[PDB]
Amino acid sequence: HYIWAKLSAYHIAELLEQEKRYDESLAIIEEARVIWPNVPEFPLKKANILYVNHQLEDAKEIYQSLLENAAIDYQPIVLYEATNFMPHKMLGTIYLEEKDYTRAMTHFSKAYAENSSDYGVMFQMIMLLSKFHQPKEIFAFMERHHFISSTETGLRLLSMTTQQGYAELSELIVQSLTDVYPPVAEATEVKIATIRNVFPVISESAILFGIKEELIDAADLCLWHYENPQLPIENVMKNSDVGDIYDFIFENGPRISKKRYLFVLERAIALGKGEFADYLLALRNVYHDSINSHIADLFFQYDFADIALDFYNIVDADEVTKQGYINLINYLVDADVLDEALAIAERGIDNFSTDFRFYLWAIKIDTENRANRISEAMDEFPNNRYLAKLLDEVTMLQDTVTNN
Amino acid sequence: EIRKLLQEIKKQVTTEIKKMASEAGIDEQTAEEIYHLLTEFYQAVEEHGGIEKYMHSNISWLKIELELLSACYQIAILEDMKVLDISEMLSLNDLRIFPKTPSQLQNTYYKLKKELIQVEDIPKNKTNIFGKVVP
Predict the structure, then answer these.
(1) How many separate domains does chain B show?
(2) Domain residues for B4?
(3) Residue B122 belongs to a domain
(4) Is the residue at B55 inside a domain?
(5) Which chain A residues are Cβ-neighbours of B129 within 8 angstroms?
(6) Which of B103, B129, B134 sits opposite A382 (nearest CB)?
(7) What compartments host this protein (chain B) (predicted)?
(8) Phi and psi (nearest 5°) for A293?
């Protein structure tokens, strides 16, 4: 019943979680939940640890409990949004991942009402509105709810929309800003114009400022240089500690880290720069044959599944990534190929034995053995309540019809 | 009613226990069997070292622990108690009769009843993703 201890335990729980020692961290939380049941910051962390560990239904249960719980009178000790904004923000994020767009908007809206300055919920709402509505309608929404509180806020929003390819929205956003420094506006106009496949012409100072204001990165410069060789991109890139990227892509120079290559490729894929992307793909030979698994995931991410499949078809299964299994399982299930999908889900259990999603896919797919698939999952996840609720459903129905 | 009885049994771990069950409408013999099974388990937990030591050993379940689990579920089920309620009640979250989680108790009861395991000591234990050949 002392506040220094409750916070001490939290420093520890948080420290362990940051070191990705989630099992040790959840142990601290469950101990805390017993000693200090009113402190909501502990359950809020279980939910967050559970979220990243892909046990979304267990996280949902906790977040939902943080808002309006009748059993515990949650009184925060340091994070006073533990029972308001943060549960709404996560529930909105989960419901979005679950494609329940209506529920996602409801929580995202509530979270924005609580804290109106979180670029996280704004980015998500803007993207969620992109699912249905047109840019002029979305900009009306953002103006209506006062998203753009300041010029700096609008720029931070602008870095997001420009990288997503929202040319018209970005155009609406920047034009509504007042007294923007001309280098900043020029860089934004060029970025919007590049989305529209307009020939890029940008001043040397605008590039220089755009890098410093984190509105322009190496991928942008490479795309622009590829589109327009008259640009002074090499001198800028060499001085920006990314000269190697320029040398590799354009000057037959030595290899860059796989992460950097895929960075430039991802931007090309994201902006719909097919000519540039094909050119970049032509450079993959110097990497290991394993590089195609990563390219495959990249293409699948932006919903080029056919192109992604074509890469996955030529990758050694040893090199297919854990997300790749998850992509492939989802693809096959949509193609009504449950036999092959189950085989990969099973494979994921063998290779990635600690990833909740694979056991859940087996349970979803293997209908004949569902109860057994659930029991196997519980063996690996003995503190997951969703699995336990699933078994009782099957177990109660069987045990009622067989016994009577 | 049954939940209150099992608590007093665990506290002891002789004549008094049979009287507690009879008052709450529980068969004295079935209560007597649980008391022997629990004491044998708790002694067995020390025969394997300490409670913390046993939990970290490669042995997940004990035959005596498995005997006690199936004994406890049977007597509780006769009281129209739900499986999940027995799981939580016997687990670390309630009576701490078993050094196991509710998911663990309910799963192993499922394994016992569906005969997926016997009542013995249990231990803790150029090709595509598609399978075709990459030229």
Answers:
(1) 1
(2) 1-114
(3) no
(4) yes
(5) 312, 315, 317, 320, 324-325, 328, 344, 347
(6) B103
(7) Cytoplasm
(8) -65, -40
